[PDB]
C-alpha cells in the first residue's frame, strides 16, 4: 500500500502515389483515332 498510495498520488505505402504518377499518362491513344 506503499505502492497503492504511489498509484493514488501518481496516476492520472512509401511508393503508392508513384503508380498514379504513371497513370497520369492514360489519355494518350484516345485522340489519335482521327
Amino acid at each position: 500500500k506503499l505502492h497503492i498510495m504511489k498509484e493514488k498520488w501518481w496516476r492520472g505505402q512509401k511508393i503508392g502515389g508513384i503508380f498514379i504518377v504513371l497513370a497520369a499518362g492514360l489519355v494518350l491513344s484516345v485522340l489519335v483515332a482521327v
Binding site: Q13, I15, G16, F19, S29
Partner: protein, 48 residues
C-alpha cells in the same frame, strides 16, 4: 587454465520466398500485378 565465458546460441532457420519478398509490402507485392494487369487488359482492349 584461465577464466573464460559461456553463452547460449541464438539461432533460427527459415529460408524461403516469403523470406525473399520481404522489404516490399505483400499488399504492394500483389499491387505489382494489380498495376500490371491493367496494362495487359488495355493491350487486349486496343488490340481487338
Amino acid at each position: 587454465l584461465g577464466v573464460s565465458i559461456l553463452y547460449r546460441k541464438p539461432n533460427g532457420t527459415n529460408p524461403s520466398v516469403f523470406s525473399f519478398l520481404n522489404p516490399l509490402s505483400p499488399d504492394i507485392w500483389m499491387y505489382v500485378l494489380l498495376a500490371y494487369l491493367g496494362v495487359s487488359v488495355v493491350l487486349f482492349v486496343i488490340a481487338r
